[PDB]
Ligand binder design. Sequence first.
Ligand SMILES: Nc1ncnc2c1ncn2[C@@H]1O[C@H](COP(=O)(O)OP(=O)(O)OP(=O)(O)O)[C@@H](O)[C@H]1O
Ligand SMILES: Nc1ncnc2c1ncn2[C@@H]1O[C@H](COP(=O)(O)OP(=O)(O)OP(=O)(O)O)[C@@H](O)[C@H]1O
Ligand SMILES: Nc1ncnc2c1ncn2[C@@H]1O[C@H](COP(=O)(O)OP(=O)(O)OP(=O)(O)O)[C@@H](O)[C@H]1O
Ligand code: NA
Ligand code: NA
Ligand code: NA
Lengths: 458, 458, 458
Amino acid sequence: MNTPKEEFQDWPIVRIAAHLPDLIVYGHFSPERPFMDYFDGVLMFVDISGFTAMTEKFSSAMYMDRGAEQLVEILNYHISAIVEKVLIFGGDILKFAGDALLALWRVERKQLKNIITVVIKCSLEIHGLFLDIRVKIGLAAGHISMLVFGDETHSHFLVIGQAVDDVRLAQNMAQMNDVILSPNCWQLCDRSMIEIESVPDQRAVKVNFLKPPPNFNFDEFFTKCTTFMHYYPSGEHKNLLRLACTLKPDPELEMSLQKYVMESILKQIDNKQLQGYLSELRPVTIVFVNLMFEDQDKAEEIGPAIQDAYMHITSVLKIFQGQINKVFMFDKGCSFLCVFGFGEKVPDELTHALECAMDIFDFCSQVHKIQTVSIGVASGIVFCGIVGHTVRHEYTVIGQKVNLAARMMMYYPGIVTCDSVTYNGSNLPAYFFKELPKKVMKGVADSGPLYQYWGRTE
Amino acid sequence: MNTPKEEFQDWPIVRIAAHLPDLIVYGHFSPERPFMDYFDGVLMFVDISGFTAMTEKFSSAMYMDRGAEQLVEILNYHISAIVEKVLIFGGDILKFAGDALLALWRVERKQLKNIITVVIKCSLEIHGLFLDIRVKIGLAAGHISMLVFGDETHSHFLVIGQAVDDVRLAQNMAQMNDVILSPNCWQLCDRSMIEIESVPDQRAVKVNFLKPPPNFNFDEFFTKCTTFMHYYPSGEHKNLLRLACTLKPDPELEMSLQKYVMESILKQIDNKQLQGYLSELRPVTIVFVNLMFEDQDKAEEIGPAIQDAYMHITSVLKIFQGQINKVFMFDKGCSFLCVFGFGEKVPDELTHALECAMDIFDFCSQVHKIQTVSIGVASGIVFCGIVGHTVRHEYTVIGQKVNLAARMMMYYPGIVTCDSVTYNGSNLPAYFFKELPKKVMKGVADSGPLYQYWGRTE
Amino acid sequence: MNTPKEEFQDWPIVRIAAHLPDLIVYGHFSPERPFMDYFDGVLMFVDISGFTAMTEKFSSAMYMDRGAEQLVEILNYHISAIVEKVLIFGGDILKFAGDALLALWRVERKQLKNIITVVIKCSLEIHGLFLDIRVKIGLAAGHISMLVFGDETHSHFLVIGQAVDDVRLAQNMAQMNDVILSPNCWQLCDRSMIEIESVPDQRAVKVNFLKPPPNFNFDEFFTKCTTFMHYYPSGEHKNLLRLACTLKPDPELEMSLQKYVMESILKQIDNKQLQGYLSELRPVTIVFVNLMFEDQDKAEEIGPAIQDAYMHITSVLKIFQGQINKVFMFDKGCSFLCVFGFGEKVPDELTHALECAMDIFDFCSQVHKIQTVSIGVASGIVFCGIVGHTVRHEYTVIGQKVNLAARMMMYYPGIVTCDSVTYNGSNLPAYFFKELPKKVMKGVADSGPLYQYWGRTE
Ligand SMILES: Nc1ncnc2c1ncn2[C@@H]1O[C@H](COP(=O)(O)OP(=O)(O)OP(=O)(O)O)[C@@H](O)[C@H]1O
Ligand SMILES: Nc1ncnc2c1ncn2[C@@H]1O[C@H](COP(=O)(O)OP(=O)(O)OP(=O)(O)O)[C@@H](O)[C@H]1O
Ligand SMILES: Nc1ncnc2c1ncn2[C@@H]1O[C@H](COP(=O)(O)OP(=O)(O)OP(=O)(O)O)[C@@H](O)[C@H]1O
Ligand code: NA
Ligand code: NA
Ligand code: NA
């Protein structure tokens, strides 16, 4: 009787699960919203510095209208290699945001110290790897909360809390090529093996090297650590990067997981649209919404506020034809990265983006526990596409206007701002705006004039 | 000198042969029509009970317009596993009809007894495997005839005879989860190994278990049986589910095989249309045509009659824009499962379906050796797509209206009937119909009012 | 720590490199135009005789509108097998032209003799392999020059010189199934091992067999020869047909290589169009342009002339909507195989083809060092598609009109000619043409009337 080879089965549910972390794929939690859970772990935020500049260059004539194709290829070649190290070292990639990603090693509190060594080692191999591209890495460890918010057809998750704030702060300090530990990570780690230098005006520290003791064998130490890793591929499946590669059809699980993934991606998953059409350099409008709270580490406070704000944001995006591309905590606040055009006639798309932004601003300002709303609106050519590895990848955007909109909303809090492309392009009369003082902004060479969107009445 | 790996070659001819059994792929018989051949073998009819109800449910809002995608995924996951057992145990899958299939072990008469043991063992492993889904299995054995009918561009085949009637009868008796043997199968089998219980008002029997004797080794017994299996993958190709996976381009063979496969499937095979678009839940009209004969086990009588009727059916389907989806023998008659919309404006599609049905009814009623024509017309949302395994799969339909149309044509013989969706929707005046008595029908909870299509004149 | 399998990565750059030889992929030469380089090697020109006739037949009704699909399948099945032998024996396939190809073993001068034995052995295995299809093979050896010409967005290469003329001459002598050596190849080869017969009125010779001496082991001899093969897959990559399968993203290299490949192919590479649509039997107009030089073996003379002519050809093809499909040296001249329709309204496409041909004729006639321009214009159904192996394939055309246009331009030099389909179809008045004497042409049974395109004025 033959025992013929069974082919890898690339079911829709498996393709869907490439877009999500094990935290959701295997999570099985309540479908109620907001939902909150609490755990501990180590976080790694990995940033490839330089793709934003490359993005601009790939619009140039030398790329012969294949810029988006070339950009995504060279980006995924590099990011793929990082994704593989993360996964082989046992991490769960939570999200991609442009040319960066955030990973988690969720473990019981006693195991944090050892896993910190695993993550440090991972970081240093990543730092080793391989355009003018640098990698910066921030690490944090401690208490983490997860929030899941949404409606009956869409779900979104976030991690929240001091370790999440720390991992942002750490990454923002890294010089090109640093690996930075949050103060708490440094406090919890195996200091006898981890050799650091100090950081100016900071309690965070920079890793110089690992100095294992005489009897230390990394392979055996890792093996012990894998006792605590619920989904580490093993035994018959030890040749796989993710357990989620073995998921089987299950209509209930697929119904739940598809709610996290945008419809145009589901269309490609279902082989109803060609792959190529989602990788593009297209003119869009970014609307970057920031919500600040009295206490942004307290899920049970902020969770309902985020859900409330989400319910309105989504109804208003539907009307003005925008989408939520990504949601994450900044150091300061919960941020919604929304996109218009991914389109109407262009004075109209611009105008809608602005009216949508004002409406979200007015509504969210009144939501209980939201301290401040800030929104930045910027327009230009940005890269849109699927970034990552075959087994773990996400739709995302990269571009100078994405970063500019983020910087605006942070440096001009409490108001709606827009750049001159948006100002000049909109259908709206000039006295709906106020020309603003030029601020010097981290990461930004020249914004051109910035404006506040004051709105219809005085 | 390198000996580099030669990749699997997924030539068009191999993709075509996934849609057909070895009985045709390797058959090489005359292109004349009707063509008839005679042999012996064992038949297995496997039915997954429950997908028809799931189909209805997958239209519901919770599936978020991905019902067809989810339906086909969960269906193929299960059916694939059945297909693999059939093939590993040496069977040839002849056809898929919705969530059921029919398989054949063609062998010389002396080998029937032993192969019956193979098929029984296969059935019991299938029954073992793994929604509210049950599998029922009927088995028959004996003389089988094959008919091939068609025109210069299209070919269709059928198996005919007492073993084919028996396998239908057997399957219809199975309770959820039974494996039933036809009387003749029971008569021919190795009764010393096969432990059965009786079936009420029936000579067919139900299998309880295998009870092999002391010296029996299934692996060695199977190996002996494979001497008689012309196309069992072996030697260099023992890791393949089908020999047809190794077929090589051959324009003559491809010309002959493509005639069995519908044009929209050939378009997908040739990479001229996206895969996804053939899996759909779409409103269609089913026209289920049943031809009854004086003697439906006699190929040389019925073969010309079927060909004659086919020639007219196909010319009329062309005019009214329908297609033949599947042809099979019922216990009572040869049945053509035709589909409209897989479309025109809807009072028109409905009207055409009805006029086409009357025309086929009038013509076929006069074909020599056709005793009765019955036709059921039902309209609604049905699943359309490719069902099966990668190596063996077919386009088919599943839905409550498909089954209702089959039940109508059987419970209201000698006339054309339609359901109320078709009645109410058609462009035709009411006195073209007669409202019928409500019959209680096996498998059907509520038809709603049924009608006879009386036609234009009184 | 797992070491999971890394999948083959089918990056865009790798897909691009399937369309090009190692001579370009690994060439890294100046982007200036013309560019010329000089080397030595052995050439093999392999022609599958008979596909041109099959092409016509595959338009017939028996192929049921799947002629193009069936043609490309049966062609690639055969050509693939030839490509694999070439590559395993260490050759670099330079180009495909219809059902023929040209391969190169570039080596230092001392190694020519031994490599000639490798190529002969390759030829004889190819000749062994496997419709009414015959293979003919011509071999040459000696000095070869390479020219790269083009503009800022498009690049084309050619090989030039006496060994290139010889390999054309050799192939044209081969009887169905011969392997022919150029005089110089015969002169340079290991005559003690190579058993030949003479060719009438020719110094070229025909191979009968290899007669290795007593101690000769082909495997060990080949192994020695591979010392001189820069890109022979080896060590970890010895299971690969080409080193180019391991190419990594590199935006600069991709920018350079994509310039050789047509835009519609890049669109398919980038998954923005279905594969199937490039394989077709479509009515086109072939414009076959031949440029003759005083000395066609002298790259430094002809290189600038070709570049000059290219610059004008391409600007005129843009205006009249044609494309350059392939460029090669004939025995007599540099030939540009251009195609219109791969379309406008048909009296217009025909008319444009003709006006484009006259314009190219007028311009190129005045280019310094171009002795004669001849152009043949023929219209009909021709096969268009990607021919070759997965790892090495090219877009090309095959058909009786392609060959007729080539024969016209050779048998009617110094003028523009067209066939009667083009004549009768064009929008142009009859006195723009001259009816020509019927010449008997090698390869052509019946042209129908031929015409010179005299042009607008007398
Ligand atoms: N989806 C996204 N794609 C791209 N950028 C984003 C995205 N989401 C947020 N950003 C913002 O872009 C900024 C990038 O940080 P920074 O300006 O220091 O550049 P970088 O990360 O070193 O270089 P590059 O921008 O080339 O990656 C972050 O502050 C972040 O808030
Ligand atoms: N291509 C087809 N797709 C679906 N049903 C079909 C098809 N062809 C025929 N049928 C009819 O549907 C009927 C199914 O049998 P029955 O009503 O007992 O339901 P079942 O098979 O147990 O459950 P389910 O209908 O969910 O599979 C058969 O009588 C058969 O004649
Ligand atoms: N891209 C091309 N596709 C098809 N034919 C071409 C192409 N380019 C040139 N040709 C011409 O077609 C001719 C083929 O040679 P010939 O007429 O002797 O037929 P053959 O090669 O034996 O048979 P077949 O034409 O069936 O392959 C060559 O002279 C060549 O110049
Ligand atoms: Na970044
Ligand atoms: Na069924
Ligand atoms: Na040829």
